[PDB]
Amino acid sequence: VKAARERFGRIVQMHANKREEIKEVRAGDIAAAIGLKDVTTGDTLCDPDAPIILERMEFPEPVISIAVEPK
Amino acid sequence: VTSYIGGEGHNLQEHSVILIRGGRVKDLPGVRYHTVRGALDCSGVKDRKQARSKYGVKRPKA
Amino acid sequence: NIKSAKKRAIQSEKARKHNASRRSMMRTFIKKVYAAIEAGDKAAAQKAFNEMQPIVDRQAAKGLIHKNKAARHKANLTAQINKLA
Amino acid sequence: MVTIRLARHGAKKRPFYQVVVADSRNARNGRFIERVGFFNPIASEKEEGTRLDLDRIAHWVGQGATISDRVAALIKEVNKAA
Amino acid sequence: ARYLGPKLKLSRREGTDLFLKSGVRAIDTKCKIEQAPGQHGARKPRLSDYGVQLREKQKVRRIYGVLERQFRNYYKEAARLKGNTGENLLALLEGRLDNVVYRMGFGATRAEARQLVSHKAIMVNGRVVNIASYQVSPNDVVSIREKAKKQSRVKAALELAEQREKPTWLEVDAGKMEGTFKRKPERSDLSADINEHLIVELYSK
């Protein structure tokens, strides 16, 4: 959804009370990828040879607005 | 310092983040820099086709 | 710091303490000789001189004073013990 | 102590050692006392391949210089055994 | 790297056949040689010293199919090498393998010959050579690989080749399809409306 590729490096699974390190991450699992450059929320990370956009949940859209000045 | 915003049309306003290029304007004394279209908050020129590298306009999907 | 070549620190402490007491003593004999020189007691000078020579000479070999210092001490002290004594 | 050894001067995947005498404590391609030849583990069976200024080696070996095991093998293979 | 654009047009700008379509007939025409290299090609633009100076070196480049950076390097080398820097430019230029392969008639056009060099379809002194810019020495022998020894292209290639004015500093065959760069070509035995001092002085200012 950005038409840019990323290179996975370190990977971590939050494991109750320890950020354990992993080298591989299979399907049906969740994790956090360290260091990924330009990945915002809702983006699909697929295989570059077999490319796909996924559904992407929805963005609740704000109900309250306010002006702020930097004191 | 003050800087030019070449090209037809632009966004840019009070809190925009931009990129200064250097380059004067022989019409605006004291203006000694250009704004670099298409870097940071400064969008490229709309619909420009010739010389798009300047004015930061990506190739119109051939 | 967490590198077992910290035992080096504990060793060199033992070393200082050793060198400490010896080099202390050595000096206190070189002190004795000048005591005569200052006192005028011409005999006491050679007495101690000949008493310190073995210390000083050994300490050069032991390598806690290294050679020419031992040389210099007895050297110029000779040059003083018989300049009136 | 001073030693005769190989300093890598080739290029990635195409080395070219330089036999040279130095204080062992210096860096490999660093400060040296004197160069004494080269060893080109490539070249093939061409015009050259190795060269040892054996007089100079032997000279330095005289003042208590030592030989790097790979240089030793190289000397004991440039012959000088008949 | 290669040019790739429409090739006759190039010739049409230079006002000469640079044999980019050596192929067969025409030797040009069925092109409208000169009188319109573009929409405005049909004019007589009186061009400045810098223009002809450009056009001329630009001519040489298109003939051999060599691009600026490499061609610069060819000039810089030519400069360094002893002798009239002007002519020994052409020397490196002429000594290019791809050029030699064309000059020996193994390929119809210089561009064609290049493709041949690229496809490992040519060897030198016993050894296979891929790169079109391989610098050929004297006594070197360029030969066609057996794997592709006389198939359709190279046949016709050697065919109309021999019907062309022929070389001197190298001897071809046609039976074994092999030849020898006998010696470096001298400036006398290659020319036309091609000067140098133009293209020499150009890179010197």
Place this chain on the structure above:
Amino acid sequence: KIRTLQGRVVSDKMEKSIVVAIERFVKHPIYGKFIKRTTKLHVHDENNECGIGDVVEIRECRPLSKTKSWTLVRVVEKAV
């Protein structure tokens, strides 16, 4: 031979410690003129053997004090 240097005295009273000036002509690094170049050295001469005005000969030597590494050897000319 003995690497030595001539040069006149200057400054007298210092107690076995004469100081000598050594002119030299040298070409200017860019413009080429030859220009004068004084060079003051702290010389030692045991038993104040000379004095101001004297063209003296000296040689380099062991350190004898802070800026003092040259001994007096001959003398040439003296009076005023």
Place this chain on the structure above:
RNA sequence: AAUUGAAGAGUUUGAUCAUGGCUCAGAUUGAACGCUGGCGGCAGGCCUAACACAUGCAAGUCGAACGGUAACAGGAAGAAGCUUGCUUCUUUGCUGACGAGUGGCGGACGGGUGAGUAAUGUCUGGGAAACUGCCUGAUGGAGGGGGAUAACUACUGGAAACGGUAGCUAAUACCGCAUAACGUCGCAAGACCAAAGAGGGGGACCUUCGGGCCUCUUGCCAUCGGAUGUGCCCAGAUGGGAUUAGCUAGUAGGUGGGGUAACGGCUCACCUAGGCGACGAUCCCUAGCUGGUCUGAGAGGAUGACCAGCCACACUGGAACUGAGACACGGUCCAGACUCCUACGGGAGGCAGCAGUGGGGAAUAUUGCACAAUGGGCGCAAGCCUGAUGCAGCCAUGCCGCGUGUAUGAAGAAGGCCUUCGGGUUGUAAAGUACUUUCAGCGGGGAGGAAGGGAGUAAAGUUAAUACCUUUGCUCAUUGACGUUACCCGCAGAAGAAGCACCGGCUAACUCCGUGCCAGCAGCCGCGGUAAUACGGAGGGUGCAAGCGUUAAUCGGAAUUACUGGGCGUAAAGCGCACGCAGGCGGUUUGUUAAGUCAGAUGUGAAAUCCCCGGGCUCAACCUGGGAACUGCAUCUGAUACUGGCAAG
């Protein structure tokens, strides 16, 4: 053979010439940004915050120095569930080996950084008063004793970091004693100084049958040499400022004590009153230096990344100890700033090592692989350690190759664009038809970087010995991270692979349309107010091409700081004028001198770079052999016209 190479143009005016600034064409970059993006080779990659740092790694290693057994194995001062010679428990340090401890060597190397440092450094050249582990050549020593201590053990404190008392033990730890010269002190007579053992094998002989004893290999002491490393001294050269002109008490010298490896106000007392400075001291500001790099015809200017040499620094300030070497990057102590752990009593730490984070920024990479090669630490060795190094990952950042096809193809299709509606152009381009298959892709095979180490066996090498130990042949197994390596051969199919800038003059390239001093362009002059080749689009064209532009930056052009190589009557420029110190310069003859100058000779000017000729990767970049070069410094010896000095005119 070998640094053999110098271009101008635009712009002041109505026009001209001159002057003079500004501007442009070239080359270069550790770059960035914008648009675009196929591969490979070699190379480069925090230029800013020497800003703070989570996490892992970056220094260990010897049982052939010592007491040793906790674990691992075998063997067991030898045994079960019985599965009788295959096991897994319990014991034994037996042997391999090895946690912790004493000891030894290393941790002062390797690697990072440019803060500090305008001369406590660096470059070139000289010099005398010094120490120097490991490696080495040589001469002799290697006798005989002694007191301890970690570990360990018994109590005992902590949350932890750490430990506390008491008792015992080994050594190549430690200390006497003997020995004592070609060593130190001394004129001499004389005085006086050291050390250590450990292993492999073995005929007899001997034995508490542990060994003694023999032999071989290592290690220890001492001294004089060598080699390498370092310390110290002098001279010249090494930024800007005078809107900084005075500076100076251990200041300058001497004497005598002390001091260091060593010379020395290095230190201390006394005595002289000096020492520095316009040839720029002092004080400010900036800066690590050189080899070299970039530019330049050169002379110059600019610069100090990558490689190598040198120096300095290791959170900040300061300090010593250990030691051959440190005033110690991953040591110690003290203070500071900061951060972290705490069971609140107390504790811990410094990525400018590699990788990586945060932060700053226009901007700079993976928390990878392997010790296989080279090289370093320890070790007899095997080996172990090694973020040095060798490789791989990431980024078009650069340089160099290569590709993204090749040929054929016309009344010259359509479409677009121009048109005086006759046509012209894009354009042989496309389509179509022959043809090829590099590189990518898929399958096979497959160099080289590997030389060595391990066993065996054969050699008056040894020795008492056919053992042990050393060398070398030969023989048999075997050692790569890269690695699906390079490269080779098969297979399919033009298939996966073109952009960016420009087209008023300088400046290579012209038209229509929109717009109408608007919207905008612009390096410079200047375009725009209705036929705009200058704005925006289009067609066409020129230039570069996996890059192209733009910006930033250095040199060039610039003879525009003019040494080479310029100027001042009116263009900017003669002080209003004289006298005069310092400095610069100096008529004419002889002799002498030999500083400058000249000539020749010898050391030297690191390597890499540049350049020449070759050689090696399919080519090139890249790598490499030898030379030339390094225009310099120093010294000795010469030459005597000119210059300078001295003598007489």
